Amino acid sequence: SELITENMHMKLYMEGTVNNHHFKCTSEGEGKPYEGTQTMRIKVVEGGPLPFAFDILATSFSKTFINHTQGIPDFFKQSFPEGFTWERVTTYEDGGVLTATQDTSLQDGCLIYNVKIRGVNFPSNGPVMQKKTLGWEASTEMLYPADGGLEGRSDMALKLVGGGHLICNLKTTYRSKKPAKNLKMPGVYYVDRRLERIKEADKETYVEQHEVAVARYCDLPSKL
């Protein structure tokens, strides 16, 4: 009866194109969904080595592995067995735009992700296309219910060679494949996360990536 257990395995398939460079990746990983932790081992299977920074793909590689505290209704875990989808636009402040759409299903006890990526207008001499990035700062997503699904918003900061940062803003739409009558919706809430590259090999043809994510309400005193 409980479909999301203490330990879960994932398989992912990704395809897309950034500034007209086509690529595919696959990954395998494991996580602890109630701890909010996960690791993936990713391989670039076509179009490698990537002539752009792997960091721009990092958020496209898993919302079942968020630790929902304070009894926050969990839209993602509640969605099984049917699963859920997400669609996102990421807008870089230097004009790069990356759109991604994802399906999450559960098949034979394994989480299955299918991701499609389209990135356009990354500046040809910018840090993404010149591979001058160094991973992501920790970030906070705000989630709120809208039209029977959830919307998500975050700003994220990309570390740069030299010590600067390039900021991007994410708008995400989350939709459940389970009927609305069988789901308990959350109110507005927040997810804090770290997204970390653990190691890479051969010009990021092999990447190991890790996330920790925890969901919470705003715990500051209200006067309302």
Token digits for 85? 């989808």
Resolution in A: 1.8
CA distance 52 to 92: 14
CA distance 114 to 118: 14
- Sequence-separated (6 or more) residues with CB below 8 Å from residue 17: 23, 117, 118, 119
Cβ-contact 200, 173 below 8 angstroms: no
CA distance 116 to 96: 17
The Cα-based distances of 190 to 30, 95, 167, 196 in angstroms read 24, 27, 19, 19
The Cα-based distances of 18 to 45, 132, 159 in angstroms read 15, 16, 20
CA distance 91 to 16: 17
Single-letter code of the amino acid located at 79: S
Per DSSP, 221 falls in state P
Sign of CA dihedral 43, 116, 210, 66: negative
Rg (CA), the chain: 17
Residue 63 CB-density burial (10 A; 0-12 exposed, 13-18 middle, 19+ buried)? buried
CB atoms within 10 A of CB 24: 15
Q: For 89-147, give the DSSP string.
A: EEEETTS-EEEEEEEEEEETTEEEEEEEEEEE---TTSTTTTT-EEEE--EEEEEEEET
- The Cβ-side half-sphere exposure at 106, using a 13 Å CA radius, reads 20
This entry's atomic model was obtained through: X-ray
CA distance 109 to 207: 25
Please give the residue range of the domain that contains residue 55. 1-224
Task: Kindly report the backbone phi and psi dihedral angles of residue 121, in degrees, each rounded to the nearest multiple of 5, phi listed first.
Answer: 65, 30
**Number of structural domains, the chain?**
1
- Sequence-separated (6 or more) residues with CB below 8 Å from residue 37: 31, 65, 210, 211, 212
Q: Is the peptide bond before 127 cis (omega within 30 degrees of 0)?
A: no
CA distance 197 to 49: 17
Element (H, E) at 75: helix 75-78
Q: What is the CATH number of the domain that holds 162?
A: 2.40.155.10
CA distance 95 to 8: 37
Sign of CA dihedral 118, 102, 11, 31: positive
Token digits for 110? 């394994």
Q: How far is CA 97 from the centre of its chain?
A: 16
Could you tell me which residues are beta bridge partners of residue 172?
88, 152
